[PDB]
Amino acid sequence: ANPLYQKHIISINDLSRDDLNLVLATAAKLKANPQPELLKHKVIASCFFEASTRTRLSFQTSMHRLGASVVGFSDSANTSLGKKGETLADTISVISTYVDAIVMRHPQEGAARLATEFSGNVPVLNAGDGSNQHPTQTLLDLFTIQQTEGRLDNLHVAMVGDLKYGRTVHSLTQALAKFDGNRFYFIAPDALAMPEYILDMLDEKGIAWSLHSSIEEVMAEVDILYMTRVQKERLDPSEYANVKAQFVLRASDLHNAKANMKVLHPLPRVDEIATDVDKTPHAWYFQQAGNGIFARQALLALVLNRDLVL
Amino acid sequence: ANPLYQKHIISINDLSRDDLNLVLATAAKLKANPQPELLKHKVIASCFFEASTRTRLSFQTSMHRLGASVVGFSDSANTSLGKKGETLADTISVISTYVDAIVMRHPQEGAARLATEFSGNVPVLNAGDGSNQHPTQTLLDLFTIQQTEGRLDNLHVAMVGDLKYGRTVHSLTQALAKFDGNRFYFIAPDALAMPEYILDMLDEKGIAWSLHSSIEEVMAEVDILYMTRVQKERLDPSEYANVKAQFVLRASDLHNAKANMKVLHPLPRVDEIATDVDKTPHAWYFQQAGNGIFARQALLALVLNRDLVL
Amino acid sequence: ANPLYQKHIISINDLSRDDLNLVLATAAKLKANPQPELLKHKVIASCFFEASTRTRLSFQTSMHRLGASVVGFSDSANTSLGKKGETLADTISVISTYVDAIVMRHPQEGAARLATEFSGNVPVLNAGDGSNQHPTQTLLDLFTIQQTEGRLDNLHVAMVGDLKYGRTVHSLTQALAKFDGNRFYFIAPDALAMPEYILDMLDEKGIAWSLHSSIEEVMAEVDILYMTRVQKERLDPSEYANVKAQFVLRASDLHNAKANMKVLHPLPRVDEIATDVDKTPHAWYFQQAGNGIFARQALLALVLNRDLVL
Amino acid sequence: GVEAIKRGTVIDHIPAQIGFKLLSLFKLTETDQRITIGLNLPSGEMGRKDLIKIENTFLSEDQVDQLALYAPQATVNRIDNYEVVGKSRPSLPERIDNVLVCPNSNCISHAEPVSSSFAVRKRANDIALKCKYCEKEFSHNVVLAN
Amino acid sequence: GVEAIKRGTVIDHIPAQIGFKLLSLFKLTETDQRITIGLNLPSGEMGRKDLIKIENTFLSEDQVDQLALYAPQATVNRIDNYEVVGKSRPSLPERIDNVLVCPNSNCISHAEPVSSSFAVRKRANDIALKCKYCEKEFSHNVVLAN
Numbered sequence A, B, C: 001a002n003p004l005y006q007k008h009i010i011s012i013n014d015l016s017r018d019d020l021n022l023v024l025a026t027a028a029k030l031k032a033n034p035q036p037e038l039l040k041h042k043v044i045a046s047c048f049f050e051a052s053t054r055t056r057l058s059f060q061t062s063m064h065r066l067g068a069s070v071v072g073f074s075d076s077a078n079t080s081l082g083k084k085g086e087t088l089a090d091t092i093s094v095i096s097t098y099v100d101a102i103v104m105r106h107p108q109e110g111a112a113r114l115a116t117e118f119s120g121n122v123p124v125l126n127a128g129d130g131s132n133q134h135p136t137q138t139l140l141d142l143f144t145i146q147q148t149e150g151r152l153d154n155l156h157v158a159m160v161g162d163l164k165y166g167r168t169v170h171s172l173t174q175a176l177a178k179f180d181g182n183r184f185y186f187i188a189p190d191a192l193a194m195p196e197y198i199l200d201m202l203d204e205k206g207i208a209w210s211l212h213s214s215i216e217e218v219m220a221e222v223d224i225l226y227m228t229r230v231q232k233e234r235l236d237p238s239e240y241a242n243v244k245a246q247f248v249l250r251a252s253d254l255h256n257a258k259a260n261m262k263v264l265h266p267l268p269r270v271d272e273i274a275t276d277v278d279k280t281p282h283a284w285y286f287q288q289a290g291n292g293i294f295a296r297q298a299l300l301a302l303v304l305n306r307d308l309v310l
Numbered sequence D, E: 001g002v003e004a005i006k007r008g009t010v011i012d013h014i015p016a017q018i019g020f021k022l023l024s025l026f027k028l029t030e031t032d033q034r035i036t037i038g039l040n041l042p043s044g045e046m047g048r049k050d051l052i053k054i055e056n057t058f059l060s061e062d063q064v065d066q067l068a069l070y071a072p073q074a075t076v077n078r079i080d081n082y083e084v085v086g087k088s089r090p091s092l093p094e095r096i097d098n099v100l101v102c103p104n105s106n107c108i109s110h111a112e113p114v115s116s117s118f119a120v121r122k123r124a125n126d127i128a129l130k131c132k133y134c135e136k137e138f139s140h141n142v143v144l145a146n
């Protein structure tokens, strides 16, 4: 069997550099050599309890492209959880008697983990849980850095925006800390700083990070500028000061950047990234999006099919 | 004619130290020897466009103690301004053809100055306009200090809470800088600091003021500890950080206090003054309220009577 | 000093048969020979935290017939209690520094008792507190019975409707058990039965009471048929079963009635008294309302005047 | 004996499973003075007892009144120089201040800054508590219950 | 002494004012069996220790470990007929299940019918607690609700 075969994918914290590389090698293989009936006869649940454009559509296109069938919801209001007050435990309990895997997005931290407890032999894939994890996001991110930088080690990584609630940076930071000689630059308002629990590990793994107050004290030395959106729907009133992007990127700030340097963003972007950047060759976010198809295909293949791909 | 005879009481910036003195002298006088008919045959309009418990009832009580009648509203919702789309200029133009004085409290700064331009001969009394001024609070406040301290000079005054939106402390500050030797100590969240226009004034008039991070650091030397409520309804969302009171007074913090020191508060109080303070001899906010009767009775008598012989 | 001189009129449980008698004697007296200036120079606060048509206007009419002035509110929404978060304890503390008596109607039981603890020397009159008491209704009710029956003893009284939430029938029951020989007949949906605390009292005082399933079974022997409206606004959802009136009176059911029998109703009436009842000589609810003037005029005169010589 | 102290209080005959409650409600534990607690100790009468011992400490006037409500069987023993200088048994007061919570949800008692107060009335079946504010009467069974 | 058992367990040396806490959390007092608690007693090394004695009961190793959070100085004596057969000292457990509550308001943990669960980790000053669910790590200080 393949290492990820029938495993839940809930947090980057639970995967090893090994797991990661496997997914990336597989992704590359499928990007090259599509397998249209790899998952012929499977039925996957696409359960979204929170908003989504890229994660859901990209996950569903991938299922279709590998020959799988898809059942699900993109809104919980018309689910019996929505209207009859059923617990989520009861919801994963029955849904897990119909499909071969559950993909799910939920607004509360640890929903993905709670479902693993009530799904039986049916793997659960975390499409995002509150502000905790977003593992399949880290995957397409990793695939993109490698694709554009040529490696995953000895990278200079700047993460700007909302690091407190951005489940995307939690996951990616733990992914790259698993590699060596990675260097972190964290640019955020103090109310939205990178969680303590994340720095503590950087420290222990003896990885180097610094806080900067401007995109510009780090521009000339970064390989990757990972921008993020303020998780406006996650803040409490006490934090409404911070609703507006404190760090905005214009094509103009890309004046001292290395030539390999790419600007990534999980999307969507509000105003933290002006549209004039879209034209510069450092703009890689639409490409980043597109890769979600390969990384999300490689994942499903591994989790639902015993044997390694061709 | 007295100096105040038929004057508009809009801003404390428009009255002199003598003007202020004439009101406390008269207030002092009505308190001892009442006049049930100075305002016999006068109709006063009481127009509250914003909520009020104390400012409106004390004014209306004051009006009746002096024999005048009252017409008005406590809710602009049933006026033709609230339902048929009438401007304030037109409201004031017609109400001024009916009454003898107009008392008005409004949500927008400068609402009371504008009324003076449409009222003709009819005195407008500002019961509060947005976070601008509250001259009638300042008259009952001066009256209370004087009465408990015996002077309006050489006092050591502390103003705590929301100094920014506090129409009450904007007026009191300008009133006490009209007297000699007053020393101010301002304690407020940064977001809610005293406007610079007031600070510029203490500076010009070369008045001694200081900013403090705690009540306690000034506790042993104030004559007056003036607490204010956070103007929740005026805050901008970025300031929602500040909704809760940063400085809370408790019986226990009065340990150091001078014996003569009194705690004043324009009221209402949320959580900034614990109720245990209520039982100490420092607590003077309920006697301060009561004094709104004598100070508002004295102001109505001067604006409307050419000569007051008491 | 009269017995009622400066007393708080909170609960009928706090007044004796003599107290009650002094009000009907005085009410009887003001009705014949009016006093346009007993309350000359008094300011009374009329504080309605709950809707009222009759209780507030009769009290305010009563106040003016006697020469007193009135300040107050009919809507707590524009007070600083409604908008700035002020407690009732603080509201009452300051209003009590302005006025001579405080009339208050509130949605929570015991609201009026609490006010007595913050008002100092100022008499609080309970115009209704939740589904607890309505002492001033009971005074105008006793006055009406007496006047139409000639006694307050040996009557046969029927109370119909919502007995549970009826602050009106809670007070009247305690008032008539203070007189000798009264016999009660209670007709109410089970859900809306008379609280046991009242029943325990009739029992102790060894008063004869009975429960009936119909009006008609007692029609031929009541002196007073006291109808009540279902307290829709007080019901708990489980009681929504009871929203409609179970017992409806129609002209036709008065066929059996004693000639002297009168139909009383605190008002307003929904569907429990058909309008055809209005044309019969039994219908006495509009004359009952009118009597709120004489009974409330007599109570204000006693609380506020040490000696009444009429 | 079983736990002789010099000078302190001793509560015995505490209905089983109430010993802990009282150690909590009374505030018995916010002390620096040696306490001894015996839980699920046997009683010849109704079957099991809890007993609390507090050294250099005596039970407030109210505190023994609250006992009335809770352990209406409890015996409060006073001690001085290892001697049972005085022996009291709880009696139902007339009114209980600020420890009870009015079961009437619409009581002002909840929303405002006041202390609860109930008038006590020993019936024939239970104790009847009357809320000073709402005037509604409840069974101490309902008032006291979790 | 304080009170000797023939069988059961003795938890000697519960740092002062923690004897109460533990009687609460590990619900050690929800039995029809004899518990003997001595609060605020001495013995050289530290001036006032709390001793808890449960008869006809034996703690495990899991249960004994949890105790490490509150009293890392403790000593559980395993009694099998009057004298001290077994003696164990608490050791930081791998995780604490069901006793605590996640301070993350948005934990799925609150809403749904799962058992709380935390992974216990050593930092410097304190013990960090990491929610099984929300994966947020807290300080032993904050987990315990205030």
Ligand SMILES: O=C(O)C[C@H](NC(=O)CP(=O)(O)O)C(=O)O
Residues within 6 Å of the ligand: A051, A052, A053, A054, A055, A056, A128, A134, A137, A166, A167, A168, A228, A229, A266, A267, A268
């Ligand atoms: O929402 C963002 O800011 C980050 C990230 N977004 C994405 O996954 C893309 P989408 O919400 O379209 O699925 C997420 O955490 O949801």
Ligand SMILES: O=C(O)C[C@H](NC(=O)CP(=O)(O)O)C(=O)O
Residues within 6 Å of the ligand: B051, B052, B053, B054, B055, B056, B128, B134, B137, B166, B167, B168, B228, B229, B266, B267, B268, C080, C084
């Ligand atoms: O609102 C306050 O905190 C202060 C001050 N308050 C008062 O005037 C008292 P009131 O709102 O009852 O008239 C205000 O500026 O309106």
Ligand SMILES: O=C(O)C[C@H](NC(=O)CP(=O)(O)O)C(=O)O
Residues within 6 Å of the ligand: C051, C052, C053, C054, C055, C056, C128, C134, C137, C166, C167, C168, C228, C229, C266, C267, C268
């Ligand atoms: O509301 C009723 O049905 C009975 C009674 N009604 C009255 O007092 C008349 P009103 O509401 O006009 O003052 C009440 O308890 O408020």
Ligand SMILES: [Zn+2]
Residues within 6 Å of the ligand: C110, D102, D103, D104, D107, D108, D109, D131, D132, D133, D134, D135, D136
């Ligand atoms: Zn109550």
Ligand SMILES: [Zn+2]
Residues within 6 Å of the ligand: A110, E102, E103, E104, E107, E108, E109, E131, E132, E133, E134, E135, E136
């Ligand atoms: Zn959690």
